[PDB]
């Protein structure tokens, strides 16, 4: 495929989310919307807030329709309360369509909006099963497909810079692409490998093996999907079930033991800094997650580098050091393949064929010695057994 119009239509970074420009209402009100594959509600700030430079003003939209229904959405971190309605929505650097979609006008929120993020709403791209108040609230993408003939799939290339970006840089730089209704070959290298969406609620997948520098973590595979395993562009970190997280950290610490870091670093509580240009990437291991393939008894793996799991953060401390935060953390709600992981790959959410594709991203951060990878196939048995019920 080739959709130059939508190439480079995203802005943002892993720590604050990636967003796309949208317009809502009549006349059009331009708003930046966070792209969230871990939720299913389309919502926008609709009242003043310290972190919003603009918000949706329903009284100024002639096409706004009040559904007279309240709505509440809680997330792993953050939540908001709002009022449901519908209005006309367009995506300036997306397909040239206009759709009437459900919209949650956010009236109250806690730790949802983020200072300096530059986004004012969220686009839940997952399935109706998890939409609030319930699955009768049709998600944005479902309405787009029903009302237009846009192919039922979208792809994401989230681009991490590999270094900290200040406010102006995040505004003036391209954070990636969201190709709606297609796949753009200029966004990846090598071939696409697909894993099946286990169930249409979150974008759920099954991990069947984990390696740290080629060494098998060797845990019962059900543990890797303990509870569930999802792909979520709205989550910064690679998050792992508590037992997997402990085993993974023990193994990464052992591979990097030539240098010692405070416990707080491994808990994502503090940063580690190295003098300008001397980050010892080579001492950190690559991490491979093997995913169930589309072919029976077949799997493939995606491998990420420390350039993906060590998130660049500025050192307000005045210096030219390169600093980072450990971007893998524990979860009590299953595995979350967050932005840190998606930054290494072009990810195709093929809803039509109920599968998620991965290819090496043409914008992933790496060094001259190692690159992220997507490789297959591997003969793996009894994989369905890795799923938790």
């Amino acid at each position: 495929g080739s959709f130059v119009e939508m190439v480079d239509n995203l802005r943002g970074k892993s720590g604050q989310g990636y967003y796309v420009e949208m317009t809502v209402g009549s006349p059009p009100q331009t708003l930046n919307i966070l792209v969230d594959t871990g939720s299913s509600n389309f919502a926008v700030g609709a009242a003043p807030h310290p972190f919003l430079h603009r918000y949706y003003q329903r009284q100024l939209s002639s096409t706004y329709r009040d559904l007279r229904k309240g709505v509440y959405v809680p997330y792993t971190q953050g939540k908001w309360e709002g009022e449901l309605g519908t209005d006309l929505v367009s995506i300036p650097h997306g397909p040239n369509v206009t759709v009437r979609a459900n919209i949650a006008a956010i009236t109250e929120s806690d730790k949802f909006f983020i200072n300096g993020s530059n986004w004012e709403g969220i686009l839940g791209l997952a399935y109706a099963e998890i939409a609030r108040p319930d699955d009768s609230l049709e998600p944005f993408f479902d309405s787009l497909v029903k009302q237009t003939h846009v192919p039922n799939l979208f792809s994401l290339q989230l681009c991490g810079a590999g270094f900290p970006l200040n406010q102006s840089e995040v505004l003036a730089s391209v954070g990636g692409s969201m190709i709606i209704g297609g796949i753009d070959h200029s966004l990846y290298t090598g071939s696409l490998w697909y894993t099946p969406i286990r169930r249409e609620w979150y974008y759920e997948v099954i991990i069947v093996r984990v390696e740290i520098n080629g060494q098998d973590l060797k845990m019962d595979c059900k543990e890797y999907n303990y509870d569930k395993s999802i792909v979520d562009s709205g989550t910064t970190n690679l998050r792992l079930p508590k037992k997997v997280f402990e085993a993974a950290v023990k193994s990464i610490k052992a591979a990097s033991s030539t240098e010692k870091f405070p416990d707080g670093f491994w808990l994502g509580e503090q940063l580690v800094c190295w003098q300008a240009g001397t980050t010892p990437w080579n001492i950190f291991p690559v991490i491979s997650l093997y995913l169930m393939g589309e072919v029976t008894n077949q799997s493939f793996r995606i491998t990420i580098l420390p350039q993906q799991y060590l998130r660049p953060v500025e050192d307000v401390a005045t210096s030219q050091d390169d600093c980072y935060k450990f971007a893998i953390s524990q979860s009590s709600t299953g595995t979350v393949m967050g932005a840190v992981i998606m930054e290494g790959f072009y990810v195709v959410f093929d809803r039509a064929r109920k599968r998620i594709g991965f290819a090496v991203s043409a914008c992933h951060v790496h060094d001259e010695f190692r690159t992220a990878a997507v490789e297959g196939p591997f003969v793996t048995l009894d994989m369905e057994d890795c799923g938790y019920n």
Binding site: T37, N41, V73, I122, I130, G234, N237
Partner: peptide, 10 residues
Amino acid sequence: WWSEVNXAEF
């Protein structure tokens, strides 16, 4: 200063 997003509970 490092922000972090962790977007639904079900």
